[PDB]
Design a protein around this ligand. Structure first.
Ligand SMILES: *[C@@H]1O[C@H](CO)[C@@H](O)[C@H](O)[C@H]1NC(C)=O
Ligand SMILES: *[C@@H]1O[C@H](CO)[C@@H](O)[C@H](O)[C@H]1NC(C)=O
Ligand SMILES: *[C@@H]1O[C@H](CO)[C@@H](O)[C@H](O)[C@H]1NC(C)=O
Ligand SMILES: *[C@@H]1O[C@H](CO)[C@@H](O)[C@H](O)[C@H]1NC(C)=O
Ligand SMILES: *[C@@H]1O[C@H](CO)[C@@H](O)[C@H](O)[C@H]1NC(C)=O
Ligand SMILES: *[C@@H]1O[C@H](CO)[C@@H](O)[C@H](O)[C@H]1NC(C)=O
Ligand SMILES: *[C@@H]1O[C@H](CO)[C@@H](O)[C@H](O)[C@H]1NC(C)=O
Lengths: 167, 49, 270, 49
């Protein structure tokens, strides 16, 4: 114990990593973040990357199965590797954006239709029809002839101060 | 811009495509498969020559 | 351990049977519901000639009936019909000697042991269990399979359990692809007395291992009941081939039925 | 009797399915998954596929 540091004992451990042309058996700590649900996120499960909304699922996955596909063969469900609970994957909301506009010669005010998207995923006078979310159109109970066909039986016309009314 | 015109006639004009690009990224991996026994080496009471 | 030598060695002649529509295993770990999916994989073609034999687990009575060494090809479907767990393990390799790496997959009374090592297998691998009259229970007490095992490349021991020492049909599928050895297994209560039962049942994946070795032959290992001094188990073997199958997944993700495309024109239409 | 309509529906659906399945074809690239190519190969290598 009284020798100099040069003559004192030192315990040495050398870690070598044998990487052959064979399937690997040792990996470092897998970095897993907290799970997020009901929000379009960029998810990654055991190397399967994707983008979508992860939601609680009622599907009865078999014990050995890790993924769930469909006719498109796209990942429709997944299994959380840490906690064995099934999650349904829904495509991140997307859709066409059209513009219901009375002739610019008539007015510059326009309404915007997001086709087939619920009125919750839009950033921010909001009408939720089967065609989609119509923003800038004042819903009217009165029914007139179709002027600018939005769809699903809903048509929007510029009328009486005047504004665009969908009916 | 879509119509390549300065006068837009009454109608509905498909202009753009709206997407909801994700707010954050989530990674989930199997936390445990088997504990590599590094302690058996580092914490060994006696070392070899 | 030290090999046990038998002066007299013999093997029963093989017999042939019709595979009916067995040998279907889940090709991937995907979940599919109430759908039909076409997969091109190594399957057991429907109605294929299957070579089956019997494994004697008791002597009564100095003749050692040894199992044969069968080729492996691209994978093997192995069915066992028995009352007690007579078939216990398998040995895989090309030379089955210390010259080349060999794999041993056994299910002893304690746990399942899988070892990939340069084994020097015994001529007549032996597992021996004696009845403990005081304890009124059989207890394995002899294991002489390989004379030596050096330069081990893989080891895996499952958790300890107690194996129990109206028939049971245990179907297994072994497939060596891309350096991965995949084992699928299924267990069913079969009341048939003889012959491979006719029916359909998917095989759940049991385990895939990254052994990464070359296999061309294999052999079966049976259990022996030492007695102070007839219902021998039977086992069938078929060889997988690259086939296109149409599998039907029901609502719960179970493969209810399968169709072999190349079997007959009707299946090609299907 | 409704076959005339049914076929129509089916035909449209069929096309869509084919279209969707065309996303799982390599066409000669290393893989049909674009994210895999991006994350496994550098852009100079990726652009070719
Ligand atoms: C790993 O995840 C499982 C899943 O529930 C958990 O039971 C276990 O405690 C976890 N282990 C560690 C070391 O985090
Ligand atoms: C605007 O439209 C009205 C009728 O809709 C028409 O009388 C008028 O000439 C138009 N103005 C221009 C500048 O085209
Ligand atoms: C939009 O979402 C809300 C809550 O998530 C739901 O109640 C409503 O039915 C949805 N709209 C449509 C058209 O499904
Ligand atoms: C339209 O009428 C329904 C019932 O007839 C009523 O619930 C709704 O509030 C009305 N909308 C407007 C804008 O008055
Ligand atoms: C060694 O053991 C001590 C306590 O006995 C512990 O604090 C330390 O983290 C261990 N080291 C390793 C590498 O496990
Ligand atoms: C199986 O092979 C045997 C001889 O190898 C033959 O007699 C028998 O007909 C074959 N089975 C079928 C279904 O053809
Ligand atoms: C699917 O599994 C559930 C699990 O309880 C069961 O209740 C249901 O009957 C099964 N479906 C069919 C068609 O058997």
């Amino acid at each position: 114990p009284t020798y100099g540091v040069g003559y004192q004992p030192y315990r040495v451990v050398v870690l070598s990593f044998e990487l052959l042309h064979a399937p690997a058996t040792v990996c470092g700590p897998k970095k897993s973040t907290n799970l997020v649900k009901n929000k379009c996120v960029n998810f990654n499960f055991n190397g399967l990357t994707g983008t979508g909304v992860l939601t609680e699922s009622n599907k009865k996955f078999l014990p050995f199965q890790q993924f769930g596909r469909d006719i498109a063969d796209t990942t429709d469900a997944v299994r959380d590797p840490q906690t064995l609970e099934i999650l349904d994957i829904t495509p991140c909301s997307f859709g066409g954006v059209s513009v219901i506009t009375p002739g610019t010669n008539t007015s510059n005010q326009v309404a915007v239709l997001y086709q087939g998207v619920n009125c919750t995923e839009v950033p921010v006078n909001v009408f939720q029809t089967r065609a989609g979310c119509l923003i800038g159109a004042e819903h009217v109970n009165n029914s007139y002839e179709c002027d600018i066909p939005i769809g699903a039986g809903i048509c929007a016309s510029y009328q009486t101060s005047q504004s665009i009314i969908a009916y | 811009c879509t119509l390549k015109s300065f006068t837009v006639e009454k109608g509905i004009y498909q202009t753009s495509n709206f997407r909801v690009q994700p707010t954050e990224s989530i990674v989930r991996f199997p936390n445990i498969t088997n504990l590599c026994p590094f302690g058996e080496v580092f914490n060994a009471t006696r070392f070899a020559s | 351990s030290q090999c046990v030598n038998f002066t007299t060695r013999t093997q029963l002649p093989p017999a042939y049977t019709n595979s009916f529509t067995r040998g279907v295993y889940y090709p991937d770990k995907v979940f599919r519901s109430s759908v039909l999916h076409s997969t091109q994989d190594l399957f057991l073609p429907f109605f294929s000639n299957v070579t089956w034999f019997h494994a004697i687990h008791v002597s009564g009575g100095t003749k050692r009936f040894a199992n044969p060494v069968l080729p492996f090809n691209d994978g093997v479907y192995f069915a066992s019909t028995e009352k007690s767990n007579i078939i216990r393990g398998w040995i895989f390799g090309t030379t089955l000697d210390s010259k080349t790496q060999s794999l041993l997959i056994v299910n002893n009374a304690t746990n399942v042991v899988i070892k990939v090592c340069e084994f020097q297998f015994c001529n007549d691998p032996f597992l021996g269990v004696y009845y403990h009259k005081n304890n009124k229970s059989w207890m394995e007490s002899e294991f002489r399979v390989y004379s030596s095992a050096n330069n081990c490349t893989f080891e895996y021991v499952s958790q300890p359990f107690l194996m129990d020492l109206f028939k049971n049909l245990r179907e297994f599928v072994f497939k060596n692809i891309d350096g991965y050895f995949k084992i699928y297994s299924k267990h069913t209560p079969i009341n048939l007395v003889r012959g491979l039962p006719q029916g359909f049942s998917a095989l759940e994946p049991l385990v895939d291992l990254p052994i990464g070795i070359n296999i061309t032959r294999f052999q079966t290992l049976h259990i022996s009941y030492l007695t102070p001094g007839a219902g021998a188990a039977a086992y069938y073997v078929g060889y997988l081939q690259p086939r296109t199958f149409l599998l039907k997944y029901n609502e719960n993700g179970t493969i209810t039925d399968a169709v072999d495309c190349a079997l007959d024109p009707l299946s090609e239409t299907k | 009797a409704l076959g005339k309509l049914q076929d129509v529906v089916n035909q449209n659906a069929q096309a869509l399915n084919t279209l969707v399945k065309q996303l799982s074809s390599n066409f000669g690239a290393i893989s049909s998954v674009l994210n895999d190519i991006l994350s496994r190969l550098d852009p100079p290598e990726a652009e070719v596929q």
